[PDB]
């Protein structure tokens, strides 16, 4: 869902 998509966004470090 959007909750996971937001979780990948915050942890993205590239």
């Amino acid at each position, epitope marked *: 869902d*959007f*909750q*996971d998509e*937001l979780d990948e*966004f*915050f*942890k*993205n470090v590239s």
Partner: antibody
Amino acid sequence: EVQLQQPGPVLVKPGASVRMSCKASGYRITDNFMNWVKQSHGKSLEWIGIINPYNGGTKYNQKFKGKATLTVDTSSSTAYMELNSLTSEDSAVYYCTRVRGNDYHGRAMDYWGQGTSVTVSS
Amino acid sequence: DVVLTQTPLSLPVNIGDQASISCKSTKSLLNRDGFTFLDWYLQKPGQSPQLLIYLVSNRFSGVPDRFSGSGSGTDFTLKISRVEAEDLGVYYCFQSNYLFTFGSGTKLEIKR
């Protein structure tokens, strides 16, 4: 101290675009995500979008995808929101804010700009 | 979206009294790691919003300890244990688990 500096009140004609700025200071702009929040006169707050100044990645409220475009200039420690196709509904105060972090740091907006008030009028 | 319903919307309070604001969520706020990104903001007249409570119950530095926030899942609460005159303003809850959304705002007025 952490400060977000937003320009003063701006008047823009309908149908044009407007790019408002937000100067971060007292911290390194790339260490913190930034939110932009909209507040229409006498109305609640509304989240527009979130930018990660390190890599420019953005995420938008669906109601503002196509209307707002968040960018960041690292070198000058300034974040920008561009609004396009301005109508009377885009007359409001726009806030840039800094996000504390993630997980047990909180995703809260801990410091807020004073807000840029925008009147759309012919 | 996630709708954050706040109760009450108008809160007339006496100076010295306790005051509570409820915040109900249409969805349960909990990411995979177990974090509830529910915050509380105060907007005083003519000022930017300012952070009060983040992560449900952690008090932002500088906030007096009169302010506390509890709750789990879909029900949340903000408490002011002893209300001062300078606490008048609009109180917003805010979630960052799904696409971020504010509550309608609670207008706290001083009864005098």
